[PDB]
């Protein structure tokens, strides 16, 4: 049966692991950013000695890297930091094409569109902002806006229409349709602050939590709010399967692993269990991503480390 | 603090028997705005500005908009 085996453990950071992701065209890659400054991008050696080397680091920011996202080719790599700065990087060497100029405040959330000619920012501004790759403003949202701090966006996978999602700690989430830049529905639910969202990579679904730590579902197209499952504490991160319909939500001292058809817990991954006390005795897990093969899942987590796992059957 | 937050004169006047001093020192409010004159914190004990608000009545429902 499908379950999970402890991969092993990568070692490169000074600061605590903010978001991991991975192009699919180079799964032999995967890119990382942390709060010591700096997004390193790794070579990745298959031996359980280790289990990756960093190849280089790309250096330049004067605070954290909060979220950091890949390129449809590969070849760019793209970030969002507390400095209220983006940069364009060229994953070749380094040196930045674009630095893109203009926030009053942090850049938490920030991703990067299918056709590579879109986008698009969260800040704490309460500001989400559309950028031309060429690294001017397309548009601002500021009518109609979060009342609180914008925890997340992305870009929606569809058929060809443009949707985007947002969310904000102001217990909402508010999807936008482009070329008129409006309200396409509100959803209420969630007690407390929204950290994060993520849609299905056929792109109907939204899956959100936050504080509250548990995972509704809202339809994008429907609009109709589906259930509602208790995810535990608090879930930080969210990340669908490509090759299947799970679910991986990211608490505290575990990550849950979530079947959906028929809804249940998989497993629990646990870590190394030494002896420490007391808030906290394993370092909360905060970020996760799928490799493209679907085998291997990552994640980020508050004691400097990324951890591997690897599906068994 | 002294700088901004207060003012202070002094003027000698005579009388048939020597000289006396006046002196006056007075403190200036001003805190909330305008004209602005001196600064807006106060300046002994720097106080936090402090607003409020705290309400939800959350419930989870789909409105389309």
């Known amino acids: 049966t499908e379950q999970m085996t402890l991969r092993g453990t990568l070692k490169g950071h000074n600061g605590w692991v903010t978001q991991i992701a991975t192009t699919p ?3 032999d890659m995967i890119l990382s950013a942390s709060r010591d400054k700096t997004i390193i991008m790794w070579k990745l050696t298959r031996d359980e000695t280790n289990y990756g080397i960093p190849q280089r680091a790309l250096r330049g920011h004067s605070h954290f890297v909060s979220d950091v996202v890949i390129s449809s080719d590969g070849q760019f790599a793209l970030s969002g ?3 209220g700065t983006l940069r364009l990087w060229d994953l070749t060497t380094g040196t930045t094409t674009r630095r893109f100029v203009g926030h009053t405040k942090d850049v938490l959330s920030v991703a990067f569109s299918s056709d590579n000619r879109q986008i698009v920012s969260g800040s704490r501004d309460k500001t989400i902002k559309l950028w031309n790759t060429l690294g001017v403003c397309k ?3 500021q009518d109609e806006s979060h009342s609180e701090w914008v925890s997340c966006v992305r870009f929606s996978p569809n058929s060809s229409n443009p949707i985007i999602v947002s969310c904000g700690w102001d217990k909402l989430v508010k999807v936008w349709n482009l070329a008129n830049c409006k309200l396409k529905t509100n959803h209420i639910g969630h ?3 929204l950290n994060t969202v993520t849609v299905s990579p056929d792109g109907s679904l939204c899956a959100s939590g936050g504080k509250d730590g548990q995972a509704m579902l809202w339809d994008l197209n429907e609009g109709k709010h589906l259930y509602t499952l208790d995810g535990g ?3 930080n991160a969210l990340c669908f399967s490509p090759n299947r319909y799970w679910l991986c939500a990211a608490t505290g001292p575990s990550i849950k692993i979530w079947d959906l058809e028929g809804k249940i817990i998989v497993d629990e991954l646990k870590q190394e269990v030494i002896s420490t006390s007391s808030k906290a005795e394993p370092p909360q897990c905060t970020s996760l991503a799928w490799s493209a093969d679907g085998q291997t899942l990552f994640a980020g987590y508050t004691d400097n ?3 591997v796992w690897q599906v068994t059957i | 603090p002294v700088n901004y937050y207060v003012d202070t004169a002094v003027r ?5 028997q020597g000289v006396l001093g006046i002196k006056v020192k007075i403190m200036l409010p001003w805190d ?3 004209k602005i004159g001196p600064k807006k914190p106060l300046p002994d004990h720097v106080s936090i500005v402090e607003p409020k608000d705290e309400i939800l009545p959350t419930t989870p429902i789909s409105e389309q908009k």
Request: proline share 8%.
């Open chain 2, 32 to 34: 909330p705005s305008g």
């Open chain 1, 191 to 193: 007690t407390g602050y």
């Open chain 2, 12 to 16: 000698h006047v005579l009388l048939r």
């Open chain 1, 139 to 141: 548009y601002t949202v």
């Open chain 1, 81 to 83: 930091s507390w400095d």
């Open chain 1, 233 to 235: 504490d608090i879930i």
């Open chain 1, 25 to 27: 065209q180079f799964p």
């Open chain 1, 305 to 307: 480390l990324v951890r």
